[PDB]
């Protein structure tokens, strides 16, 4: 859509058609979406492309009740690793604005504290889609929506940006679809039969353009409201609905488990060259 | 951008993260564009996605002077293999409208004969960008621009569609960049130094959204006019300029040489599971 000026001259290694970047993993989905692993991207090319568009990335994070304790490490490590060099707007949703730590930000980065009422299962999807629609459309190009009980340990950058993305759940990337913990009751809007499903995406890291993220969160919120009216709560709450949405609306990139990992639970397997965004004990 | 309704339930093999589709070839570029090979896509998923948008594909082909002889086989084989099931509009540019063969088309497909003056090196880029701009924007979603001295032998479908694509030249996909026959004189707008270049794209098959194809063809036409004013003609004419454009504006998919092959010259190597669109003797 938007007019893109030419890239400057760059000197980098030639990609070789008869040499894969990675032979140990699937790097493209069957609907031709890249699956983002280390070794698949030249970050210099991508940084150029996204800086030439003056890209602004919004990051939403919820810190309600005791989870305000996680904000200091989350934000300080985001400053070290998340979209460095690009414009970033953090949106911290909290019931305790005074408990938000004072974190020093790099240039071109800003943080907004958005107070929410105390307490729900629907809160994140509702808030991203019903309350913040207009603000996000005016302020950022992409939205990234993550859990707070996390820290950045390595690069998370513009390689993730695309109209719509989900992230492979670290516990299920090697699982067959029948083993996925999708909602299996046909009475739920999140229902997925045992013979359907591409991947099990984790609810803790998804994103896309503002328009696509509002579409996803609106759809998930509406589906959760239908379930509530029908007296059913999906097995994994908003994650169950996110999985149903991404089954029916294929993401345009999929992030590998580099982007959502728990080292205490799962170690550091050979397939992960980097642990980028990792669980903190809760 | 445009609102996308949900995919229906579909039953197909689960993609497996720890099993690549292809281990013998590069299937994604370093800027995260898919490289389209057989085995990388589920055409049922893609057909659903593109049919749900009622996608219309325009195909431009030039048949000037003796090359009108190639139209019958080109069009009859396009009917068997090109975008079958989707809406197709062929645009045949010719100096001999009466020499266009009467080819029977499947439903949802149409052909327009567009007369051009007899005779130039710039003609295709000029015509696609200066003369047809308004018509294409109203009539089709994507444009596909190909040589006529060709036949379809196998499936060429919506897996190629994306905002901007080029095709790997069949003679150079295994070559190092210093061997690419880019324009090497710095006096040409098409100049690419020996340490730059991702791929050598062939001028005989490129495309994208109407907007991106008009951008590319406008840029190439303008650059060719500068060269003409400066008394220089690039070594491979519009192909040299196409290569310069796609170096500076990275394509969002790259087609493998399945999509542009010469079997008399190059045989049928192991890396090609299908020969889709192939040279006819000229
Ligand atoms: O008191 C709270 C509780 C939550 N939160 C917020 O919600 C996020 C998800 O919760 P959590 O990390 O516990 O679940 P995980 O197990 O890591 C994440 C998973 O489990 C959830 C239920 O606990 C849902 O099912 C979710 O959809 C799924 O991904 C948390 O990071 C906070 O940003 C908050 O601010 N205050
Ligand atoms: O008398 C003619 C001559 C051409 N054409 C039209 O132009 C197309 C390209 O030419 P050709 O296939 O000979 O070149 P190839 O070697 O297969 C294609 C290559 O060589 C070209 C010069 O001959 C350019 O450099 C081009 O950019 C490059 O890809 C041809 O398919 C016709 O649609 C026509 O209608 N009448
Ligand atoms: C010890 C806890 C075992 C958790 C293993 C599976 O992870 C859980 O998967 C659920 C879906 O089946 C849902 O996504 C919650 C998820 O648990 C979260 O993520 C894990 C990787 C751990 O970090 C865990 O502590 C966290 O609650
Ligand atoms: C016998 C001809 C040898 C041609 C080998 C290389 O192909 C040529 O590459 C040029 C760029 O260096 C330019 O793209 C023309 C291209 O030749 C065309 O494509 C070939 C695959 C053959 O089909 C050939 O007949 C055709 O002219
Ligand atoms: Mn969490
Ligand atoms: Mn040709």
XYZ file of C-alpha atoms and ligand atoms in Angstrom:
692
model
C 0.000 0.000 0.000
C 2.095 2.887 1.364
C 4.835 4.153 -0.982
C 8.205 2.557 -0.203
C 11.419 4.359 -1.173
C 14.420 2.397 -2.434
C 16.764 0.562 -0.093
C 20.312 1.927 -0.057
C 23.286 -0.108 -1.285
C 24.055 -2.840 1.248
C 26.846 -5.427 1.446
C 25.785 -8.770 2.916
C 26.135 -12.499 2.214
C 24.368 -13.754 -0.890
C 21.447 -16.057 -0.222
C 22.048 -19.360 -1.960
C 19.106 -21.142 -3.460
C 20.666 -24.619 -3.056
C 21.570 -23.957 0.609
C 18.669 -23.767 3.128
C 19.042 -21.462 6.140
C 17.672 -24.208 8.433
C 17.187 -27.931 7.591
C 16.067 -29.020 11.056
C 12.808 -27.044 11.172
C 9.824 -25.963 9.096
C 10.484 -22.334 8.060
C 7.297 -21.679 6.036
C 3.702 -22.717 6.719
C 1.544 -24.507 4.062
C -0.183 -21.156 3.439
C 3.227 -19.531 2.680
C 3.683 -17.634 5.950
C 7.266 -17.503 7.233
C 7.973 -19.256 10.532
C 10.516 -17.027 12.227
C 13.653 -18.799 13.477
C 17.196 -17.613 13.960
C 19.122 -17.993 10.707
C 16.093 -17.290 8.478
C 16.387 -13.480 8.398
C 18.942 -10.792 7.742
C 18.035 -8.220 10.372
C 19.968 -5.450 8.580
C 17.690 -5.735 5.533
C 14.584 -5.847 7.702
C 15.670 -2.935 9.880
C 16.232 -0.849 6.737
C 12.811 -1.738 5.348
C 10.961 -0.906 8.558
C 12.966 2.237 9.428
C 12.335 3.604 5.939
C 8.620 3.469 6.830
C 9.194 5.126 10.233
C 7.459 2.175 11.822
C 5.922 2.584 15.281
C 5.297 -0.508 17.361
C 2.841 -0.549 20.230
C 3.323 -3.127 23.002
C 0.421 -3.920 25.290
C 0.964 -5.513 28.663
C -1.434 -6.100 31.577
C -0.291 -5.895 35.174
C -3.270 -6.349 37.454
C -3.163 -7.182 41.185
C 0.121 -8.888 42.197
C 1.458 -8.974 38.612
C 2.590 -5.347 38.915
C 5.707 -6.945 40.479
C 6.763 -8.205 37.046
C 6.818 -4.794 35.338
C 10.327 -3.643 36.312
C 12.159 -6.603 34.759
C 9.753 -6.794 31.850
C 10.234 -3.155 30.853
C 13.969 -2.917 31.618
C 14.680 -5.977 29.489
C 12.324 -4.712 26.749
C 14.519 -1.627 26.618
C 17.546 -3.843 25.985
C 15.997 -6.159 23.398
C 12.597 -5.133 21.989
C 12.590 -3.162 18.708
C 15.726 -1.234 19.573
C 16.212 1.592 17.084
C 12.531 1.748 16.194
C 9.707 3.824 17.631
C 8.018 2.030 20.559
C 4.949 2.920 22.587
C 4.313 0.790 25.659
C 0.730 0.597 26.936
C 0.635 -0.671 30.508
C -2.864 -1.597 31.671
C -3.028 -1.727 35.453
C -5.305 -1.346 38.458
C -2.397 0.261 40.363
C -0.926 3.199 38.391
C 1.296 4.167 41.353
C 2.896 0.694 41.369
C 4.249 1.108 37.825
C 8.062 1.344 38.211
C 9.939 4.374 36.861
C 11.881 2.840 33.957
C 14.353 4.870 31.903
C 13.580 4.654 28.201
C 15.758 5.060 25.143
C 15.056 7.836 22.665
C 11.950 7.438 20.483
C 10.195 5.294 23.079
C 7.274 6.202 25.308
C 5.132 4.590 27.995
C 1.467 5.237 28.819
C -0.185 3.980 31.988
C -3.825 3.030 31.326
C -5.841 2.495 34.448
C -8.389 -0.270 34.475
C -10.866 -1.335 37.087
C -9.706 -3.953 39.552
C -10.318 -7.578 38.508
C -12.049 -10.325 33.469
C -10.970 -13.630 31.768
C -12.222 -11.500 28.877
C -10.394 -8.360 30.049
C -7.425 -8.371 27.701
C -9.374 -9.106 24.535
C -12.100 -6.644 25.551
C -9.638 -3.890 26.393
C -7.532 -4.181 23.259
C -10.665 -4.232 21.020
C -13.422 -2.094 22.717
C -11.565 0.591 24.696
C -8.359 1.374 22.813
C -9.419 1.122 19.176
C -9.185 4.783 18.224
C -6.022 5.526 20.189
C -4.003 2.666 18.710
C -5.041 3.486 15.143
C -3.743 7.049 15.545
C -0.530 6.213 17.471
C 1.061 2.995 16.185
C 1.417 0.899 13.029
C 1.640 -2.525 14.692
C 0.438 -3.894 18.017
C 2.283 -6.606 19.964
C 0.304 -8.145 22.848
C 2.220 -10.046 25.518
C 2.136 -11.488 29.021
C 3.977 -9.549 31.771
C 5.364 -12.568 33.677
C 8.265 -12.570 31.243
C 11.657 -11.123 30.429
C 13.510 -10.378 27.196
C 16.892 -12.120 26.973
C 17.720 -11.598 23.311
C 16.669 -9.743 20.170
C 12.941 -9.361 19.466
C 12.623 -7.046 16.479
C 10.965 -6.163 13.246
C 11.306 -9.700 11.860
C 8.039 -10.412 13.733
C 6.044 -7.629 12.074
C 3.376 -8.592 9.560
C -0.376 -8.096 9.286
C -1.152 -10.960 11.739
C 1.063 -13.270 13.800
C 0.857 -15.920 16.449
C 3.548 -17.727 18.388
C 4.097 -21.479 18.738
C 3.436 -22.617 22.301
C 6.713 -23.967 23.719
C 5.092 -27.107 25.212
C 3.356 -28.254 21.998
C 5.501 -27.454 18.964
C 6.404 -31.148 18.586
C 2.886 -32.435 19.340
C 0.359 -33.988 17.004
C -2.880 -32.031 16.654
C -5.019 -34.556 18.535
C -2.820 -33.819 21.597
C -3.314 -30.039 21.348
C -5.346 -28.647 24.263
C -7.852 -26.929 22.010
C -11.383 -26.534 23.349
C -13.064 -29.851 22.403
C -16.700 -29.282 23.479
C -18.923 -28.404 20.470
C -21.019 -26.160 22.743
C -18.120 -23.629 22.835
C -17.395 -21.050 20.156
C -13.722 -22.080 20.545
C -14.444 -25.721 19.548
C -11.919 -27.364 17.217
C -12.415 -31.028 16.258
C -9.579 -33.540 16.630
C -8.867 -33.645 12.862
C -8.397 -29.844 12.548
C -5.590 -27.537 13.559
C -2.261 -26.338 12.193
C -0.460 -25.340 15.397
C -1.115 -24.664 19.082
C -0.478 -20.949 19.530
C 0.164 -19.501 22.979
C -2.015 -16.591 24.120
C 0.998 -14.855 25.647
C 2.446 -13.322 22.422
C 0.409 -12.332 19.346
C 0.190 -9.213 17.199
C -0.034 -7.664 13.802
C -1.199 -4.454 12.225
C -3.519 -2.427 14.389
C -6.449 -3.295 12.108
C -5.792 -7.050 12.234
C -5.202 -7.096 15.981
C -8.469 -5.237 16.582
C -10.217 -7.759 14.319
C -8.771 -10.686 16.230
C -9.444 -9.282 19.687
C -12.979 -8.175 18.725
C -13.758 -11.642 17.369
C -12.315 -13.372 20.437
C -14.188 -11.032 22.813
C -17.492 -11.593 20.963
C -16.971 -15.383 20.991
C -16.146 -15.315 24.728
C -19.349 -13.329 25.381
C -21.379 -15.962 23.482
C -19.787 -18.689 25.608
C -20.588 -16.744 28.809
C -24.245 -16.376 27.730
C -24.299 -20.141 27.091
C -22.734 -21.015 30.503
C -19.448 -22.382 29.178
C -15.842 -21.217 29.682
C -13.255 -22.531 27.228
C -10.567 -24.792 28.705
C -7.771 -22.228 28.239
C -9.848 -19.074 28.246
C -8.689 -16.423 25.725
C -6.023 -18.796 24.373
C -8.688 -21.244 23.239
C -10.410 -18.492 21.273
C -7.143 -17.185 19.854
C -6.499 -20.691 18.531
C -9.915 -20.874 16.926
C -9.396 -17.463 15.308
C -5.958 -18.324 13.910
C -7.239 -21.633 12.559
C -9.935 -19.788 10.571
C -7.811 -16.668 9.781
C -4.309 -17.856 8.990
C -1.498 -15.727 10.379
C 0.871 -14.117 7.888
C 3.895 -15.000 10.080
C 4.307 -17.569 12.853
C 6.933 -17.009 15.549
C 8.988 -19.997 16.648
C 9.267 -20.906 20.341
C 12.425 -18.753 20.509
C 9.856 -16.016 21.114
C 7.984 -17.705 23.996
C 10.047 -20.096 26.115
C 10.196 -21.443 29.662
C 13.762 -22.566 30.419
C 12.972 -23.888 33.933
C 10.280 -26.150 32.454
C 11.792 -27.051 29.081
C 15.541 -26.405 29.159
C 17.430 -25.317 26.032
C 16.875 -27.804 23.190
C 19.109 -27.997 20.124
C 16.458 -26.548 17.847
C 16.576 -23.201 19.754
C 19.609 -21.124 18.814
C 18.316 -18.216 20.896
C 15.964 -17.848 23.889
C 14.473 -14.426 23.231
C 11.459 -13.921 25.549
C 11.168 -16.218 28.547
C 8.958 -17.059 31.519
C 9.735 -15.619 34.934
C 8.716 -17.651 38.006
C 5.135 -16.876 39.181
C -6.668 -4.449 4.466
C -9.882 -5.828 2.934
C -12.143 -7.740 5.352
C -11.540 -11.496 5.171
C -14.303 -13.906 6.210
C -13.460 -17.123 8.049
C -12.161 -20.196 6.257
C -14.501 -23.190 6.403
C -13.578 -26.406 8.218
C -10.942 -28.261 6.198
C -9.288 -31.662 6.669
C -5.644 -31.799 5.588
C -2.282 -33.072 6.850
C -0.898 -31.300 9.896
C 2.222 -29.266 9.258
C 4.997 -30.510 11.504
C 7.398 -28.001 12.922
C 10.281 -30.511 13.188
C 9.775 -31.708 9.583
C 10.719 -29.261 6.769
C 8.739 -29.402 3.515
C 11.995 -29.196 1.506
C 15.583 -29.654 2.816
C 17.316 -29.392 -0.557
C 16.415 -25.761 -1.299
C 16.049 -22.329 0.271
C 12.298 -21.794 0.843
C 12.402 -18.295 2.402
C 14.522 -15.270 1.496
C 16.578 -13.341 4.138
C 13.839 -10.676 4.088
C 11.209 -13.352 4.965
C 9.620 -13.722 1.524
C 8.573 -17.271 0.624
C 10.380 -18.904 -2.297
C 7.692 -20.938 -4.013
C 8.581 -24.590 -4.657
C 6.460 -27.693 -4.926
C 5.907 -29.162 -1.467
C 5.897 -25.771 0.305
C 2.184 -24.975 -0.130
C -1.192 -26.556 0.402
C -3.087 -25.353 -2.650
C -6.478 -26.158 -1.078
C -5.859 -23.639 1.720
C -4.605 -21.031 -0.728
C -7.459 -21.561 -3.172
C -9.939 -21.062 -0.318
C -8.233 -17.864 0.812
C -8.136 -16.334 -2.662
C -11.619 -17.485 -3.754
C -13.101 -16.004 -0.584
C -11.781 -12.642 -1.835
C -13.163 -13.211 -5.360
C -9.681 -12.615 -6.686
C -9.247 -11.536 -10.311
C -5.907 -12.104 -11.982
C -4.838 -10.193 -15.060
C -2.238 -11.768 -17.368
C -0.385 -9.560 -19.814
C 1.325 -11.004 -22.847
C 2.900 -9.308 -25.886
C 2.749 -10.850 -29.333
C 4.302 -8.474 -31.828
C 5.457 -9.343 -35.369
C 6.215 -13.081 -35.772
C 5.521 -13.862 -32.090
C 1.776 -13.967 -32.787
C 2.538 -17.597 -33.766
C 3.059 -18.460 -30.096
C -0.377 -17.316 -28.897
C -2.404 -20.465 -29.648
C -0.299 -22.809 -27.502
C 0.285 -20.162 -24.867
C -3.419 -19.460 -24.355
C -4.666 -23.050 -24.747
C -2.197 -24.275 -22.138
C -2.993 -21.293 -19.873
C -6.584 -22.497 -19.952
C -5.442 -25.899 -18.691
C -3.059 -24.705 -15.979
C -3.179 -20.988 -15.100
C -5.397 -19.962 -12.154
C -8.062 -22.525 -12.948
C -11.152 -21.841 -10.851
C -10.308 -18.175 -10.389
C -11.294 -15.120 -12.399
C -8.780 -14.436 -15.203
C -8.504 -11.563 -17.651
C -5.968 -11.993 -20.437
C -4.591 -8.828 -22.047
C -2.980 -9.603 -25.390
C -0.944 -6.706 -26.774
C -0.370 -7.127 -30.494
C 0.259 -5.289 -33.747
C -1.923 -7.873 -35.543
C -5.356 -8.168 -33.866
C -6.617 -10.430 -36.684
C -3.791 -12.922 -36.033
C -4.959 -13.584 -32.461
C -6.269 -17.194 -32.470
C -9.843 -17.936 -31.376
C -9.268 -19.793 -28.092
C -12.143 -21.281 -26.100
C -12.103 -20.077 -22.508
C -13.456 -21.594 -19.325
C -16.147 -19.798 -17.359
C -15.085 -16.648 -15.484
C -12.255 -15.951 -17.918
C -12.018 -13.244 -20.552
C -9.570 -12.044 -23.193
C -9.015 -8.502 -24.485
C -6.996 -7.737 -27.599
C -5.090 -4.452 -27.198
C -3.656 -3.133 -30.408
C -0.274 -1.490 -30.309
C 1.745 0.191 -32.990
C 4.150 -1.994 -34.918
C 7.662 -2.276 -33.437
C 10.247 -0.679 -28.270
C 12.886 -2.384 -26.009
C 10.926 -0.187 -23.601
C 7.529 -1.212 -25.010
C 6.413 -3.699 -22.382
C 7.351 -1.601 -19.369
C 5.926 1.530 -21.010
C 2.674 -0.159 -21.971
C 1.995 -1.792 -18.622
C 2.731 1.489 -16.745
C 1.696 4.461 -19.012
C -1.192 3.165 -21.147
C -3.083 0.608 -19.066
C -2.917 2.064 -15.564
C -6.562 3.001 -15.125
C -7.994 -0.076 -16.829
C -6.030 -2.580 -14.751
C -6.881 -0.855 -11.468
C -10.605 -1.149 -12.235
C -10.556 -4.710 -13.670
C -8.107 -6.935 -11.776
C -6.556 -7.407 -8.332
C -3.195 -8.814 -9.456
C -1.187 -8.529 -12.659
C 1.050 -11.318 -13.991
C 3.401 -10.280 -16.819
C 4.925 -13.012 -18.971
C 6.690 -13.837 -22.221
C 4.597 -15.436 -25.009
C 7.257 -17.869 -26.305
C 6.144 -20.276 -23.602
C 3.681 -22.976 -22.648
C 2.084 -24.065 -19.377
C 2.715 -27.731 -18.549
C 1.587 -27.848 -14.932
C -0.198 -25.882 -12.218
C 0.466 -22.135 -11.975
C -1.955 -20.760 -9.401
C -2.648 -18.476 -6.522
C 0.463 -19.590 -4.616
C 2.303 -16.954 -6.705
C 0.073 -14.046 -5.682
C 1.508 -11.421 -3.354
C 2.117 -7.681 -3.553
C 5.325 -8.095 -5.640
C 7.084 -11.138 -7.102
C 9.942 -12.062 -9.352
C 11.069 -15.399 -10.716
C 14.506 -17.018 -10.465
C 16.159 -17.218 -13.878
C 16.625 -20.909 -14.734
C 20.243 -20.460 -15.925
C 21.504 -18.673 -12.783
C 19.788 -20.053 -9.684
C 22.989 -21.888 -8.688
C 25.330 -19.014 -9.620
C 27.303 -16.714 -7.367
C 26.363 -13.043 -7.646
C 29.593 -11.986 -9.363
C 28.569 -14.306 -12.248
C 25.099 -12.745 -12.596
C 24.687 -10.844 -15.879
C 23.557 -7.662 -14.174
C 24.366 -4.391 -15.923
C 27.911 -3.586 -14.696
C 28.559 -0.129 -16.222
C 28.063 2.657 -13.623
C 26.792 4.949 -16.403
C 23.543 2.890 -16.548
C 20.595 3.305 -14.204
C 20.530 -0.526 -14.049
C 24.095 -0.714 -12.624
C 24.661 -3.237 -9.827
C 28.185 -3.653 -8.412
C 29.772 -7.100 -8.118
C 29.261 -7.267 -4.319
C 25.480 -6.606 -4.505
C 22.568 -8.771 -5.531
C 20.302 -11.403 -4.005
C 19.163 -13.292 -7.110
C 19.106 -13.008 -10.902
C 15.438 -12.639 -11.806
C 14.239 -13.338 -15.339
C 12.241 -10.620 -17.109
C 9.865 -13.213 -18.540
C 7.639 -13.699 -15.432
C 6.974 -11.049 -12.764
C 3.850 -9.663 -11.120
C 2.084 -8.531 -8.022
C -0.787 -6.304 -7.054
C -1.797 -3.844 -9.718
C -0.349 -0.978 -7.661
C 3.035 -2.668 -7.178
C 3.303 -3.777 -10.797
C 2.566 -0.242 -12.001
C 5.236 1.036 -9.599
C 7.791 -1.427 -10.907
C 7.024 -0.890 -14.581
C 6.914 2.913 -14.168
C 10.292 2.878 -12.420
C 11.835 0.586 -15.038
C 10.418 2.678 -17.910
C 11.731 5.924 -16.360
C 15.178 4.366 -15.790
C 15.266 3.067 -19.390
C 14.396 6.570 -20.656
C 17.294 8.034 -18.626
C 19.639 5.456 -20.160
C 18.368 6.302 -23.672
C 18.984 10.031 -23.052
C 22.507 9.122 -21.890
C 23.237 6.905 -24.957
C 23.424 3.592 -23.109
C 21.306 0.422 -23.388
C 21.529 -2.051 -20.511
C 23.040 -5.445 -21.356
C 19.730 -7.317 -20.967
C 17.349 -4.466 -21.646
C 14.222 -4.465 -19.421
C 15.545 -7.465 -17.468
C 18.536 -5.457 -16.285
C 16.222 -2.772 -14.927
C 13.866 -5.306 -13.370
C 16.864 -6.707 -11.499
C 17.877 -3.285 -10.256
C 14.313 -2.595 -9.097
C 13.967 -5.899 -7.233
C 17.344 -5.414 -5.567
C 16.177 -2.055 -4.160
C 12.503 -3.086 -3.604
C 12.513 -6.631 -2.283
C 9.809 -8.904 -3.657
C 7.317 -10.348 -1.184
C 7.495 -13.779 -2.894
C 10.106 -15.284 -5.211
C 9.085 -18.007 -7.666
C 11.433 -20.949 -8.101
C 12.606 -21.997 -11.576
C 9.646 -24.417 -11.714
C 7.871 -21.301 -12.974
C 10.333 -20.407 -15.767
C 12.218 -23.337 -17.291
C 13.830 -24.362 -20.573
C 13.924 -28.169 -20.778
C 15.785 -28.291 -24.130
C 18.571 -26.155 -22.637
C 18.623 -27.360 -19.029
C 16.910 -30.750 -18.801
C 14.988 -31.793 -15.678
C 17.211 -31.555 -12.585
C 16.409 -33.291 -9.303
C 15.574 -30.043 -7.551
C 12.564 -29.493 -9.895
C 9.597 -31.659 -8.944
C 7.438 -29.917 -11.546
C 8.101 -28.008 -14.793
C 5.222 -25.543 -14.794
C 5.878 -22.872 -17.467
C 8.464 -23.665 -20.119
C 10.230 -22.227 -23.158
C 8.996 -23.051 -26.642
C 11.553 -23.090 -29.482
C 11.998 -19.642 -31.129
O -3.714 -11.711 38.463
C -3.359 -11.528 37.265
C -3.447 -12.582 36.378
C -3.067 -12.358 35.065
N -2.620 -11.148 34.661
C -2.226 -10.853 33.286
O -2.632 -11.928 32.425
C -1.481 -12.583 31.883
C -1.754 -14.065 31.694
O -1.784 -14.723 32.956
P -0.644 -15.700 33.417
O 0.695 -15.137 33.020
O -0.902 -15.998 34.869
O -1.034 -17.060 32.648
P -0.155 -18.094 31.758
O -0.385 -19.457 32.292
O 1.367 -17.676 31.703
C -0.928 -17.902 30.146
C -2.120 -18.850 29.912
O -3.046 -19.029 31.034
C -4.111 -18.104 31.255
C -4.971 -18.587 32.419
O -4.188 -18.478 33.612
C -4.967 -17.971 30.019
O -5.620 -19.236 29.768
C -4.054 -17.540 28.872
O -4.950 -17.398 27.787
C -2.913 -18.562 28.620
O -1.971 -18.222 27.577
C -0.346 -12.187 32.826
O 0.962 -12.276 32.240
C -0.709 -10.771 33.147
O -0.365 -9.889 32.074
C -2.558 -10.095 35.583
O -2.149 -8.975 35.217
N -2.921 -10.324 36.855
O 9.631 -9.694 -32.101
C 9.226 -9.809 -30.911
C 10.158 -9.893 -29.897
C 9.694 -10.004 -28.596
N 8.371 -10.032 -28.324
C 7.828 -10.128 -26.972
O 8.877 -9.919 -26.014
C 9.101 -11.117 -25.264
C 10.569 -11.245 -24.895
O 11.337 -11.581 -26.046
P 11.977 -13.002 -26.239
O 11.005 -14.059 -25.787
O 12.490 -13.048 -27.653
O 13.301 -12.901 -25.330
P 13.930 -13.898 -24.213
O 15.348 -14.136 -24.568
O 13.078 -15.218 -24.057
C 13.804 -12.880 -22.736
C 15.032 -11.979 -22.496
O 15.594 -11.311 -23.673
C 15.053 -10.072 -24.136
C 15.890 -9.557 -25.304
O 15.682 -10.441 -26.410
C 15.049 -9.046 -23.030
O 16.416 -8.743 -22.671
C 14.249 -9.628 -21.865
O 14.263 -8.582 -20.913
C 14.855 -10.960 -21.351
O 14.143 -11.611 -20.272
C 8.491 -12.220 -26.129
O 8.127 -13.402 -25.400
C 7.287 -11.525 -26.686
O 6.234 -11.452 -25.719
C 7.450 -9.929 -29.375
O 6.226 -9.952 -29.132
N 7.909 -9.830 -30.633
C 4.241 -26.661 35.551
C 3.155 -26.201 34.556
C 3.073 -27.074 33.303
C 2.558 -26.274 32.093
C 2.850 -26.956 30.763
C 1.992 -26.473 29.605
O 1.901 -25.015 29.602
C 0.598 -24.561 29.788
O -0.157 -24.839 28.591
C -1.492 -24.486 28.764
C -2.169 -25.001 27.517
O -2.257 -26.447 27.548
C -1.574 -22.931 28.884
O -1.013 -22.264 27.709
C -0.736 -22.524 30.150
C 0.678 -23.063 29.998
O 1.386 -22.789 31.223
C 2.090 -21.549 31.133
O 3.156 -21.672 30.219
C 4.181 -22.680 30.592
C 5.243 -22.738 29.498
C 4.730 -22.370 31.977
O 5.493 -21.155 31.921
C 3.605 -22.224 32.993
O 4.159 -21.880 34.290
C 2.574 -21.193 32.536
O 1.451 -21.172 33.460
C 21.169 -21.007 -26.253
C 20.947 -19.705 -25.455
C 21.667 -19.692 -24.106
C 20.931 -18.806 -23.084
C 21.350 -19.084 -21.647
C 21.023 -17.969 -20.668
O 19.665 -17.474 -20.883
C 19.639 -16.137 -21.270
O 19.998 -15.327 -20.132
C 20.076 -13.986 -20.494
C 20.633 -13.308 -19.266
O 22.034 -13.633 -19.098
C 18.636 -13.490 -20.843
O 17.712 -13.668 -19.723
C 18.137 -14.353 -22.058
C 18.215 -15.825 -21.681
O 17.876 -16.596 -22.851
C 16.481 -16.905 -22.865
O 16.186 -17.821 -21.835
C 16.879 -19.129 -21.949
C 16.505 -19.997 -20.751
C 16.570 -19.762 -23.298
O 15.186 -20.139 -23.336
C 16.871 -18.798 -24.438
O 16.519 -19.413 -25.704
C 16.149 -17.466 -24.246
O 16.558 -16.526 -25.276
Mn 2.210 -15.802 31.553
Mn 11.032 -15.474 -24.087
